[PDB]
């Protein structure tokens, strides 16, 4: 009656160049919980910006965004309110309760 | 009566260039819970922006967004409210309760 | 009476160039729950923007979006409200309760 | 009386270039639940935008969207309200309850 | 009395270029449930936009959308309300309850 | 036997505002001769030009003449040739040859 | 037998404002001769030009003449040629040859 | 037998403001001769030019003449040639040859 | 047998403001001769130029003439040639040859 | 048998402000001769230039002439040639040859 987990990675020849959250041999038992959360952001992998030119002769405004991944003008609100009673929130990887 | 999990990755020759959340041999038992959450964002993989030009002679406004993945002008609200009673929210990978 | 899971990945020659959430040999038992959630975003994979030009002589406004995947002007609201009673929400990968 | 799952991937020569949620040998037992959710977004895979030109001599407005997949001007609301009683919502991958 | 599932993928020579939700050898037992949900979005695979030009001499308005897949001006509302009693909603991959 | 000429001008109150070749009391005995002559010209007396506006957006030519008296594009030739013999041309005011 | 000429001008109150070749009491005996002559010119008396505006956006040519009396583009030739013999040209005011 | 000429000008109150070749009491005996002559010119008397504005955005040429009397682009030739014989040209004011 | 000429000018109150070649009591006996002559010029009397503005953004040429009397671009030639024989040209004011 | 000429000018109150070649009581006997002559010039009397402004942003040429009387770009030639024989040219004021 015993938990057993392991992860092997025998790499003869391998490459991980520009990656994110890779798993190349793992034994995971994660459990996660997110109540009021908020992600805002832009990500680029192997991007190229190769020549940009902006001019402005006689103007009152000029805005510009050019990069390989842009995010502008957001108004986010992510909340969770509890004014009553009882807000259990459980999250587990696994449960092993076995008799004999 | 025993849990057994494992993950192998024998790589003779492999490549993971520009990826996200890859799994190349895993044994996962995840459980997740999200109550009030919010994602806003733009992602680019192997993008190329190769020559941009904007001008403005006599204008009151000029806005511009050019990158390989753009997101603009959002107004997001993601909430969860509980003013009554009882909001159980359970999430598990697996459950092993077996007698003998 | 024992759970057994595993994942193999013997790669002689393989490539994963610009991908997202790939699985190349896994044994998964996930369980997930999303109550009030919201996704807004644009994604590009192997995109090319190869020459853009905008001008403006005498104008009061000019807006422009050119990238390979654009998203503009959204007004999203995703909520869940409970003012009564009882909002169980359960999600599991599997359940093994067998006697003998 | 034992659950058994596994996933093999012997790759002699393979390619996954620009993909999303691929499975190349898996044993999955997922269960998912979504109460009030909302997706808004545009996705491009192997797109090319190869020469764009916009001008404006004397105008009060000019808007433009050119990328390979555009989404504009949405007003989404996705909700679930419970003011009465009883909103069970269960979702499982499988259930094994067998006696002997 | 034992569940047995597996997935093989022996690839001598294969290609998956621009795909979405492919399965090349799997053993799945999914179960899913969606109560109030909403999808809005445009997707492009191997698209080409090869030369666009718009002008405007003296106008009060001009809007334009050109990309390979466009979606504009939607007003979506997808909800589920329960003010009475009893809203069971169950979804399973399979069920194995056999005696002996 | 005597020539007698004179000119009086008793001006109590008079005005000559914008005139040309006026005679207000004279005794003239002119004689004139014009062989090859040429007059080209425009004359204005008490003229008013009170607001002129010309524009040109995109043209190859635009000519304009607005004043109170215009003359344009003439090709004049006024000559007198004598290759023979005898071209007397006499002009006198008067002749007084009287005997007694 | 005597020539007698005179010119009086008794001015109590008079005005000559903008004039040309006026005679206000004279005794003239002129004689004139013009063989090959040429006049080109514009004259203005009491003229007013009260507001002129010309613009040119994108043109190859634009010519303009606005004044109260204009003359443009003439090609004048006024000549007299004598290759034969005899070109007397006499002009006198008067002649007084009287015997007694 | 005697020539007698004179000119009086008794001015109690007079004005000559902007004039040309005026005679206010004279006794003239002129004689003139013009063989090959040429006049080109513009004259203004009591002229007003009260506000002129010219602009040019993007042009290859723009010419302009605005004054109260303009003259442009003439090509004048006024000549007299004598290759034969005899070109008498006499001009006198008067002649008094009277015997007794 | 005697020539007699004179000129009086008794000015009680007079004004000569902006004039040219005025005669206010004279006794003239002029004689003039002009063979090859040429006048080119512009004259102004009591002129006003009260506000001029010229601009030029991006042009290859711009010429302008604004004054109250302008003259531009002339090509004048006034000549007299004599290759034969005999070109008498006499001009006298008067002649008094009377016997007794 | 005697020439007699004189000129009076009794000025009680007079003014000569801005004039040219005025004669206010004279007795003249002029004689003049002009063979090859040339006048080029501009004259102003009581002129006012009251505010001039010229600008130039990005131009290859800009010429301008504003004064109250302008003359530009002339090409004058005034000549007299004699290659034959005999070019008498006489001009006298008067001649008095009377016997007795």
Swiss-Prot record, chains A, B, C, D, E, F, G, H, I, J:
Q: Name one GO cellular component term.
A: extracellular space
Q: What is the effect of changing residue 46 to K?
A: In PARK1 and DLB; significant increase in binding to negatively charged phospholipid liposomes; increases oligomerization
sequence repeat positions: 20-30, 31-41, 42-56, 57-67
Positions contributing to Cu cation binding:
2, 50
The GO annotation for biological process reads: adult locomotory behavior; amyloid fibril formation; behavioral response to cocaine; cellular response to copper ion; cellular response to epinephrine stimulus; cellular response to fibroblast growth factor stimulus; cellular response to oxidative stress; chemical synaptic transmission
Residue ranges of the region described as 4 X 11 AA tandem repeats of [EGS]-K-T-K-[EQ]-[GQ]-V-X(4): 20-67
Q: In this chain, where does the modification N-acetylmethionine occur?
A: 1
Q: Could you give the domain comment from the record?
A: The 'non A-beta component of Alzheimer disease amyloid plaque' domain (NAC domain) is involved in fibrils formation. The middle hydrophobic region forms the core of the filaments. The C-terminus may regulate aggregation and determine the diameter of the filaments.
Q: Subunit structure, per the record?
A: Soluble monomer. Homotetramer. A dynamic intracellular population of tetramers and monomers coexists normally and the tetramer plays an essential role in maintaining homeostasis. Interacts with UCHL1. Interacts with phospholipase D and histones. Interacts (via N-terminus) with synphilin-1/SNCAIP; this interaction promotes formation of SNCA inclusions in the cytoplasm. Interacts with CALM1. Interacts with STXBP1; this interaction controls SNCA self-replicating aggregation. Interacts with SNARE components VAMP2 and SNAP25; these interactions allows SNARE complex assembly and integrity.
Q: Which disease is it linked to?
A: Genetic alterations of SNCA resulting in aberrant polymerization into fibrils, are associated with several neurodegenerative diseases (synucleinopathies). SNCA fibrillar aggregates represent the major non A-beta component of Alzheimer disease amyloid plaque, and a major component of Lewy body inclusions. They are also found within Lewy body (LB)-like intraneuronal inclusions, glial inclusions and axonal spheroids in neurodegeneration with brain iron accumulation type 1.
Protein name, as recorded: Alpha-synuclein
User: What is the protein's species of origin?
Assistant: Homo sapiens (Human)
Q: Which gene encodes it?
A: SNCA
Q: Which residues of the full protein are shown?
A: 1 to 100 of 140
